[PDB]
C-alpha cells in the first residue's frame, strides 16, 4: 500500500532515502496488534481513530486527554492519516495529568497494569507499548519496565531530551526495553535528543505532524514523538510475523537503515527504523 502526501516520519521509516512524502506499507497494517499508549491519555472519538482507540486506565479524576500529548503519541501509532500501523487496536493508560506530569510510582502502577490488563485483550499478533515519558535515573523505574518487557510487551521508550546521554535517564537508560532517540528531515540527530550507549534506535522525532485533542492536528518535536514511531513499526512487524515483542528491538535494530544519520556521538548506533517493505 502507499499514502501519498504523508507525514515525512512515515515516508522516512519506508524508504532507503530521506527526502520523499509517499509512505509505503503492508495492507495488514498492524491488524490483530495492540499498543499501549502509556501518556496524558487518548482523544479515543478523534475521527483520525476509526473507533479502534480506547481508554483502559486513569489514575485522575477523567481518562480524557486534557493535555493533547497522549493524543499526539497515540495518532503517530496508529491514527489512519498519521499513523504507521494503520489497523492496530490502540489502549490508552493515562499515567500523565494534563500538565504532562506524573509521579514515578503512578507511572510503575500504570506499567505493571499494562502487563496484567493484555490477559483482558484480543492482541493475537502481539502487544506493544510506548512509553513518551521520563525523568532522572530510578531503578524501581527501570525494573517496572523490565518487567513488563519480559511479561511479552514490546515495550518502546523516549531517550529523552535533554541532549545527554540517556544513562542517566529513566525509563530510558533500562538495558532490556527499545529506547528511541529522534532524528529530523534531513536525517541529523536531533538537536534535543539524548544519547549514548544505552539507546537501540532512532526514530522520526523534529516536526512531527499527528493528532491532537479537540479533534485537531499539529506539529510538534522530541524524543516522545520517535518513540511511537518504533512502536508502531513494532506491531506492524509483529503482525507481518516477522518478529515477537521480546525480538522486535533486536530485529528493528537488524534491519534498520545504518550509518545515514550526522552528528551522532561515537559509541552511539547510527540505525534508523526502516520497515524494509517492497511493493
Given at each position: 500500500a502507499a499514502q501519498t502526501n504523508a507525514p515525512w516520519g512515515l515516508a522516512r521509516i519506508s524508504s532507503?532515502?530521506?527526502?520523499?512524502?509517499?509512505?509505503?506499507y503492508d495492507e495488514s497494517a498492524g491488524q490483530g496488534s495492540c499498543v499501549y499508549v502509556i501518556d496524558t491519555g487518548i482523544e479515543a472519538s478523534h475521527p483520525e481513530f476509526e473507533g479502534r482507540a480506547q481508554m483502559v486506565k486513569t489514575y485522575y479524576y477523567s481518562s480524557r486527554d486534557g493535555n493533547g500529548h497522549g493524543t499526539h503519541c497515540a495518532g503517530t501509532?496508529?491514527?489512519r492519516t498519521y499513523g504507521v500501523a494503520k489497523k492496530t487496536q490502540l489502549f490508552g493508560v493515562k499515567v500523565?495529568?494534563?500538565?504532562?506530569?506524573?509521579?514515578?510510582?503512578?507511572?510503575?502502577?500504570?506499567?505493571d497494569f499494562v502487563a496484567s490488563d493484555k490477559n483482558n485483550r484480543?492482541?493475537?499478533?502481539g502487544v506493544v507499548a510506548s512509553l513518551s515519558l521520563g525523568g532522572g535515573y530510578s531503578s524501581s523505574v527501570n525494573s517496572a519496565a523490565a518487567?513488563?518487557?519480559?511479561?511479552?510487551?514490546?515495550?518502546?521508550?523516549?531517550?529523552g531530551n535533554n541532549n545527554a546521554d540517556a544513562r542517566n535517564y529513566s525509563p530510558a537508560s533500562e538495558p532490556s526495553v527499545c529506547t528511541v532517540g529522534a532524528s529530523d528531515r534531513y536525517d541529523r540527530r536531533s538537536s534535543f535528543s539524548n544519547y549514548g550507549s544505552v539507546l537501540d534506535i532512532f526514530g522520526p522525532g523534529t516536526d512531527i505532524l499527528s493528532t491532537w485533542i479537540g479533534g485537531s492536528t499539529r506539529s510538534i518535536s522530541g524524543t516522545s514523538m520517535a518513540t511511537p514511531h518504533v512502536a508502531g513499526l513494532a506491531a506492524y512487524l509483529m503482525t507481518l510475523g516477522k518478529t515477537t515483542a521480546a525480538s522486535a528491538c533486536r530485529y528493528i535494530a537488524d534491519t534498520?537503515?545504518?550509518?545515514?544519520?550526522?552528528?551522532?556521538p561515537f559509541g552511539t548506533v547510527?540505525?534508523?527504523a526502516y520497515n524494509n517493505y517492497q511493493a
Amino acid at each position: 500500500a502507499a499514502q501519498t502526501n504523508a507525514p515525512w516520519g512515515l515516508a522516512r521509516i519506508s524508504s532507503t532515502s530521506p527526502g520523499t512524502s509517499t509512505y509505503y506499507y503492508d495492507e495488514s497494517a498492524g491488524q490483530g496488534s495492540c499498543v499501549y499508549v502509556i501518556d496524558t491519555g487518548i482523544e479515543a472519538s478523534h475521527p483520525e481513530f476509526e473507533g479502534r482507540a480506547q481508554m483502559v486506565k486513569t489514575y485522575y479524576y477523567s481518562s480524557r486527554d486534557g493535555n493533547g500529548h497522549g493524543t499526539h503519541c497515540a495518532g503517530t501509532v496508529g491514527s489512519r492519516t498519521y499513523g504507521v500501523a494503520k489497523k492496530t487496536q490502540l489502549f490508552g493508560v493515562k499515567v500523565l495529568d494534563d500538565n504532562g506530569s506524573g509521579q514515578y510510582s503512578t507511572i510503575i502502577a500504570g506499567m505493571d497494569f499494562v502487563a496484567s490488563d493484555k490477559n483482558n485483550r484480543n492482541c493475537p499478533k502481539g502487544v506493544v507499548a510506548s512509553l513518551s515519558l521520563g525523568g532522572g535515573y530510578s531503578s524501581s523505574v527501570n525494573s517496572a519496565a523490565a518487567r513488563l518487557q519480559s511479561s511479552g510487551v514490546m515495550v518502546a521508550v523516549a531517550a529523552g531530551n535533554n541532549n545527554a546521554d540517556a544513562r542517566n535517564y529513566s525509563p530510558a537508560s533500562e538495558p532490556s526495553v527499545c529506547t528511541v532517540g529522534a532524528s529530523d528531515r534531513y536525517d541529523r540527530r536531533s538537536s534535543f535528543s539524548n544519547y549514548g550507549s544505552v539507546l537501540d534506535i532512532f526514530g522520526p522525532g523534529t516536526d512531527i505532524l499527528s493528532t491532537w485533542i479537540g479533534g485537531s492536528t499539529r506539529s510538534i518535536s522530541g524524543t516522545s514523538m520517535a518513540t511511537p514511531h518504533v512502536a508502531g513499526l513494532a506491531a506492524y512487524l509483529m503482525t507481518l510475523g516477522k518478529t515477537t515483542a521480546a525480538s522486535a528491538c533486536r530485529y528493528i535494530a537488524d534491519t534498520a537503515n545504518k550509518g545515514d544519520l550526522s552528528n551522532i556521538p561515537f559509541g552511539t548506533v547510527n540505525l534508523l527504523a526502516y520497515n524494509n517493505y517492497q511493493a
